[PDB]
Design an enzyme around this catalytic site. Sequence first.
Site, mmCIF file in Angstrom:
data_model
loop_
_atom_site.group_PDB
_atom_site.id
_atom_site.type_symbol
_atom_site.label_atom_id
_atom_site.label_comp_id
_atom_site.label_asym_id
_atom_site.label_seq_id
_atom_site.Cartn_x
_atom_site.Cartn_y
_atom_site.Cartn_z
ATOM 1 N N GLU A 81 29.285 16.915 -29.027
ATOM 2 C CA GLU A 81 29.753 18.035 -28.215
ATOM 3 C C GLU A 81 30.482 17.462 -27.000
ATOM 4 O O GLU A 81 30.918 16.310 -27.024
ATOM 5 C CB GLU A 81 28.573 18.918 -27.782
ATOM 6 C CG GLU A 81 27.577 19.247 -28.892
ATOM 7 C CD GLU A 81 26.518 18.173 -29.096
ATOM 8 O OE1 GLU A 81 25.854 17.797 -28.111
ATOM 9 O OE2 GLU A 81 26.341 17.711 -30.244
ATOM 10 N N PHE B 71 36.382 19.487 -24.671
ATOM 11 C CA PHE B 71 36.895 20.849 -24.876
ATOM 12 C C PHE B 71 36.899 21.244 -26.353
ATOM 13 O O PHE B 71 37.890 21.744 -26.884
ATOM 14 C CB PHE B 71 38.295 20.987 -24.275
ATOM 15 C CG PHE B 71 38.375 20.602 -22.817
ATOM 16 C CD1 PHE B 71 37.424 21.055 -21.902
ATOM 17 C CD2 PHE B 71 39.422 19.811 -22.350
ATOM 18 C CE1 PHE B 71 37.506 20.709 -20.554
ATOM 19 C CE2 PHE B 71 39.511 19.460 -21.002
ATOM 20 C CZ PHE B 71 38.553 19.911 -20.104
ATOM 21 N N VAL C 204 34.137 20.684 -30.221
ATOM 22 C CA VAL C 204 32.933 20.119 -30.843
ATOM 23 C C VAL C 204 33.310 19.373 -32.127
ATOM 24 O O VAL C 204 33.965 19.923 -33.005
ATOM 25 C CB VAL C 204 31.848 21.210 -31.102
ATOM 26 C CG1 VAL C 204 32.487 22.562 -31.418
ATOM 27 C CG2 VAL C 204 30.872 20.783 -32.196
ATOM 28 N N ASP D 158 40.968 10.176 -18.336
ATOM 29 C CA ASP D 158 39.603 10.539 -18.731
ATOM 30 C C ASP D 158 38.880 9.408 -19.491
ATOM 31 O O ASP D 158 38.130 9.657 -20.439
ATOM 32 C CB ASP D 158 39.643 11.820 -19.571
ATOM 33 C CG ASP D 158 38.302 12.529 -19.639
ATOM 34 O OD1 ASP D 158 37.381 12.172 -18.869
ATOM 35 O OD2 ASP D 158 38.177 13.453 -20.469
ATOM 36 N N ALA E 217 32.037 7.806 -23.485
ATOM 37 C CA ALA E 217 32.140 8.902 -24.459
ATOM 38 C C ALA E 217 33.473 8.931 -25.218
ATOM 39 O O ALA E 217 33.504 9.309 -26.391
ATOM 40 C CB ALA E 217 31.918 10.231 -23.767
#
Lengths: 296, 295, 295, 295
Positions: free
Chosen positions: A32, A35, A37, A149, A153
Site C-alpha cells: 500500500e 497513491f 495499491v 521521492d 519504499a
Amino acid sequence: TRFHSFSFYELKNVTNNFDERPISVGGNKMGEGGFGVVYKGYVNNTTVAVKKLAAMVDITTEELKQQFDQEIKVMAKCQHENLVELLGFSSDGDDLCLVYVYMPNGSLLDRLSCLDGTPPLSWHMRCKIAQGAANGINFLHENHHIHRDIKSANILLDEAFTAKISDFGLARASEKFAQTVMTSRIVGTTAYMAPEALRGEITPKSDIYSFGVVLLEIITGLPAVDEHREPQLLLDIKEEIEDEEKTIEDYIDKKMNDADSTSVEAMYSVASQCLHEKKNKRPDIKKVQQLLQEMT
Amino acid sequence: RFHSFSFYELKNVTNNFDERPISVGGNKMGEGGFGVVYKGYVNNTTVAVKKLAAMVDITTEELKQQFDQEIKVMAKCQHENLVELLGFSSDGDDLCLVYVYMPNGSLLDRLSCLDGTPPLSWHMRCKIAQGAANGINFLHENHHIHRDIKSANILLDEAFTAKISDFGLARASEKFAQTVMTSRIVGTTAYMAPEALRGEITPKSDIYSFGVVLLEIITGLPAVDEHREPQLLLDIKEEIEDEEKTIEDYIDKKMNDADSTSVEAMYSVASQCLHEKKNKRPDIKKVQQLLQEMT
Amino acid sequence: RFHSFSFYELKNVTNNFDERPISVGGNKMGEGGFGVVYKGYVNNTTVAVKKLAAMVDITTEELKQQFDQEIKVMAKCQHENLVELLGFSSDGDDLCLVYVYMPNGSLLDRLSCLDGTPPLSWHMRCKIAQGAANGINFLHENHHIHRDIKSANILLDEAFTAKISDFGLARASEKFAQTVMTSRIVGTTAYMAPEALRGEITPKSDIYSFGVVLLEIITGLPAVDEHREPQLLLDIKEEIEDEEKTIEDYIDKKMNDADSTSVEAMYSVASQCLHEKKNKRPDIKKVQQLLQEMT
Amino acid sequence: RFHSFSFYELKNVTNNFDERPISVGGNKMGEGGFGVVYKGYVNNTTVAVKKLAAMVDITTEELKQQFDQEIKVMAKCQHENLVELLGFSSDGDDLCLVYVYMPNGSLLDRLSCLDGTPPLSWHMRCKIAQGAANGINFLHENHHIHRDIKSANILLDEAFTAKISDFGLARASEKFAQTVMTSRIVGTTAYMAPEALRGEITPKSDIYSFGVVLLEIITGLPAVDEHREPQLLLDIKEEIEDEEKTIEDYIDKKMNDADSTSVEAMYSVASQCLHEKKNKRPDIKKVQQLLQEMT
Ligand SMILES: O=C(Nc1ccc2nc(N3CCOCC3)oc2c1)c1cccc(-c2ccncc2)n1
Ligand SMILES: O=C(Nc1ccc2nc(N3CCOCC3)oc2c1)c1cccc(-c2ccncc2)n1
Ligand SMILES: O=C(Nc1ccc2nc(N3CCOCC3)oc2c1)c1cccc(-c2ccncc2)n1
Ligand SMILES: O=C(Nc1ccc2nc(N3CCOCC3)oc2c1)c1cccc(-c2ccncc2)n1
C-alpha cells in the site's frame, strides 16, 4: 506507445478482482502507500506487479492523471539495471492501473524490517544494494531527472536482491540548475526530504539528501520515522553522533554477523555528506557512486 | 555427579576466555547478568563456560551463595527443558560454571534476530512457550522458585527445545504460606512481578514474569526498550485492555504463519499471568494446560 | 569484477587451511574429488573457500578449465537460489575459489543429519525443493546446463533457502538445435541420466538428476549407499512402479508432518523427472510449476 | 501396593483403546507381539497402559504366566533405572498393565530419530548406557535374568534417564549352581547370545545382548536391517576384529561430540560382552564399573 495497452477487465481478472487480502493469506494486495495499491497478478504464465491508482490524499482528477502520465513518460526514455520495468498500463474503465515486472523481494524498507518474516539482510548484501540504488539514481541525474521521492519504499529488489528505483510519478524534468526552481505544491516523504525540498525548492541536490536517509536506514535497520521511538526521526542520530553523544557503532544494526567498522563508517561518512544541510555543500550523485565503488 | 576443573582447562578450551564474539571466530557468547559465558570445546563436546566477574553491587561471598545455589538446584533438578550442568570450578577463584552448550542461544536474541538469524515462526514460538512452561512446572513441582524468568534465560538447543538457565536466584517454597519476604531485591525489572520488586518472594512471581515472555513472543519486542514509547512492554497490556490499541497492533510482523485465534489465545494466557493481584494468577500447571489447549 | 585474491590471504584466514572438522573447533567443512573446502572469515564476512586438490583424475588444464567455467557462469549468473562467488586466487598453484558461506551446509548432510543436526521436516523439504527448482530454471533460462545436480551441490543458508552450487562441469546449451556429445564423461554416477553416462549432454539430464534428489528428500536416503539393499536409490522407483513396494513404505520416518497427498505429489514429480526417454521428461519450467502447484 | 484397575477404567482413559497414532489424535504408541501400548491419563499423570494381546504363538495361559511374571518382578524390584508399574486389570478377559508414562519413548526410536526427533548426542548416550547398565546390575543383585535386553525395551524419561522395561520374560536365578535350560525359546534374534538361541538360560546372556545395545549406541544402527550390509550388527565386531573396517568407520555421524578415548572404551566393553564363549564375559557389576570409569 511501445508499452502494451491492457484493458481494465484484462487485468481485473489476473489480480483476482483486485483481491484485497495479502499473498500471505489467499489474496493479492502486496503493498500500500503512495497513491495507489500494488497487487500481484499472473500474465504470460509469469508473475507481475500491478498498481491500481487511488485518491487517498490530493483528491483531484488530472493531478493523479499527470503523475500517471509522468510515471509512464519517464519510463519510456529511462531504462537501466537499477530501475524497474513498466510492461503496460490501463486508462479505460477510468481506474488508472500500471503493470510492471515483478520484483520478487519488494522494497528495501520491508526487507530491512523483515515484514512477513524474511531473513535479515547481511552487510554484504546491503553494500551492493546501496551501490545499486546510487547507480540507478546517477542514470536519472545523467538523463536530467529529479525523483522528488527517494525512499527505501521506492527502492525495490529483484530475484538477486538488485536495488531498482521505482515510482517516478513525482519525478521532475530538470535542467543543469537553471537557477533556483520552485513549486507552490510541495510533495515527498517528510522523514527523507531535504530542507529546501520542504521549502518547495526543487533540485537534484534534494534527492542526494534523501539517499543519505536510506544509507542510514540500511546501516541501522531503522526507518526514517517511527511514532514510538526516541528519537522519532532517524535523521536526528546524525547530530547525536556529530556531538559524540554516541558512535555509529552504537547504531549499527545487530541483525548482522558480517559488518565491519571500516566499511560501515565509510558508508556513514558518505551518508553524512549527503545529509549536509547546505544543499550545495553536498556531493553530486556521481561523487557518491565513486565513494561507494571505492568502499569495496 | 559433577566434575571439578583446574581453571586453566577452562581458560584454554576458551582460548583464554577469548573476549572476541563467537559470531566472528571468537569465544565470547554473552556478558552481563552475573558473569560472562564463552563457547568452548571439552573433549569434542561443545560447552558453555560462565566465568563469573566481581561487580561492585554483590559481595565476594554473596557471589558464592549464587554459585552454590546454581549447583544446589541442578543436583536435584534434571529435565529436558532445563540446561544441564556438567561441572564447575571453585579453583582459580573467579568461578566458572560448565554447562552443555546451547547452539541457538537465547530466546531474547532470536526474538531480535541477533547476528542475522532468521525470525522465529509462530508455530516454533509456540513450542518454545510450551517448552519453558513445562520447564518451570518441574521447578514448582520440585518446590523451587527461579526468581528471574526472562527470555535471556530461556535458551534453545539445535532443535529449539526451550531450557531454563541461570538458577543463581532460585530458592525453595513450601505450601500455602505466602507473604514471604526479603531485605534485598534482585532480578530483571522489566519482567519482575510487582510484589517481587518489593522483595516478596513467591512462585507466583515466576508466572507473572513468564506472562511477560509471552508478550515478547507475540510482539517480538523486549520487555524493556529505552528508545520506545512505551519503554516497558506491560504498558501495552493496558493500551489493549483499554482499547486504545489492539493485540493486532503489536503482533510481530517478522513472522507470517501466525493465525489470529491462537495468537489471541496465547495473549489471554499472558494476560491471566500478568494479573495485578497475585492470587488471581494461574499456577504453572494451568498455564501449561492452556498452552497445550492452545496448539 | 570479482575480488581476485592473492596467495597467503586465504591460507591465513583458514588457519593455514587447517584440516580439522568444524564441529570440533576445526576448519574443514567438506570434501570431494573436485577438491577440498574450508570455513574462513574475510573481513568479518564468513566465506567458503574451495582450494582445488588435483588427483589422478584430471590434468592442470582440465582443472583450470573447471576453475574458469565457475567464474564464467558466475559472471553471468547471480540468484537467490544460486550460491554467490566473491572472488578467486589463481596466482601460484593449487587454486582457490571464494564463496559466501552457507550456515546450514548441504542438503545431503541435513538429510543425513550429519553433525547432530535435527531432521528437516516436510514443509522445509518442499521449500528447499521449490527453491532448487528455481535455481535450475534460471540457469536453463541463461541457457546453461549444470551436469552434476545432486544434494551435495544444493547448499542451505541461514534461512534454509536452497541454492544450487558448483559449476566446474557447467555447460552452455542451445535453444533447440541438436543433442550434443563429449569424449570425457563427468559427474556423480548415482544421479546421472543414462544418456549423460554415455557422454551425451542435454538440459534434461539435469532434470533426471534433480528427480533423484527429490527421492533423497522424500525418503531421506542418499543416491547411493554401499551397505544397503538396493545400493542405488534409483532402483527403488521400479520396485514401486512394479509395485513390489509402496512409496508409502519408503517415506522418511525422521519426520512427522508429511501428508500423503503432498508426498505422492512430490513422487508424482520425481517420477516424471526420472523418465527413460529424455524427451518424455518435463522441462524445469513445468517441474517448477508442479512443485508450486503442490502447496 | 499397586492399584487394581477395572478393564473399563482403563478403556476410559484410552478412549476404548483408540487405535490411531497420537499424531492424529489416537492412543496407540506402539506394539510388537507380546501386547500393545496405549497412552492414558489418570490423576493428571500421563500413563502407559499395556493391553496384552494374543498373537498366534502364545496360549492364553502362556501369556498369563508372563502377565504374572511382569508383576511378580515389578513388585520385588524398584530402581531409578527401571520402569515403574502402577497397576493392572485381570477381569474383563483382556489383561492389562499400567506403568508411569515415558515421554521420550524407546532407545531404539530415538537412535533412529523416529518421527523426526533430534539426534542424541554422544554425551546423552553415555549417560543412558550407564543408566541401563545399573538397572541390570540391580536385576542380578536380586538374582534375575531379563532374557530380552534390547534397545526397544530400554526406555527414556523426561530427563532421558535410561530405564529397562518388559519383564514378562524375566526368570528367577540363584548363585550359579548350574545353568538353567528351556524348551521355548524366547527373545529377539539379533540381540540374543548363541547359548540363548540354543535354549540355555543364564545371566550371562543379558550381558551379551547388552553388548549389542552398546554397539547400537556407538553406531546409531539397529541390531538388524534386512536392507543393509552386513544385515546384522554384531558381524561388525568381526570386520573390526579382522581390521577389515575400523570402529571409527562405524561411529554414528548424527552426533558432533564423540571422541576416541571414550568411544573406543565403550567398544572395548561392548566387545567383552559379545565374547562368543559366555563364561569369558564379565559380570554386570564389572560392566557397570567399566562404564563408570569411562566417564
Ligand atoms: O514488485 C514490485 N513491488 C513489490 C512490492 C512489495 C512486495 N512484497 C513482495 N514480496 C515477495 C517476497 O516476499 C515478501 C513479499 O514482493 C513485492 C513487490 C514493483 C515492481 C515494479 C514497480 C512497482 C511499483 C511502481 C510504482 N508504485 C509502486 C510499486 N512495484
Ligand atoms: O549456550 C549458552 N549460551 C549462549 C549465549 C549466547 C549465544 N549465542 C549463540 N550463537 C550466536 C547466534 O547464533 C547461534 C549461536 O549461542 C549462544 C549460547 C549457555 C549454555 C548453557 C548455560 C548457559 C547459561 C547458564 C547460566 N547463565 C547464563 C547462561 N548458557
Ligand atoms: O557453505 C558451504 N559449504 C559447507 C560445507 C559443509 C558444511 N558444514 C557446515 N556446518 C557444520 C555442521 O553444522 C552446520 C554448519 O556448514 C557447511 C558449509 C559452501 C558455500 C558456498 C559454496 C560452496 C561450495 C561451492 C562449490 N563446491 C562445494 C562447495 N560451499
Ligand atoms: O512409555 C512406555 N512406552 C512408550 C512406547 C512408545 C512411545 N512413544 C512415545 N512418544 C511418541 C513420540 O514422541 C515421544 C513420546 O512415548 C512412548 C512410550 C512404557 C512405559 C513402561 C512400560 C512399557 C512397556 C512395558 C511392556 N511392554 C511394552 C511397553 N512402556
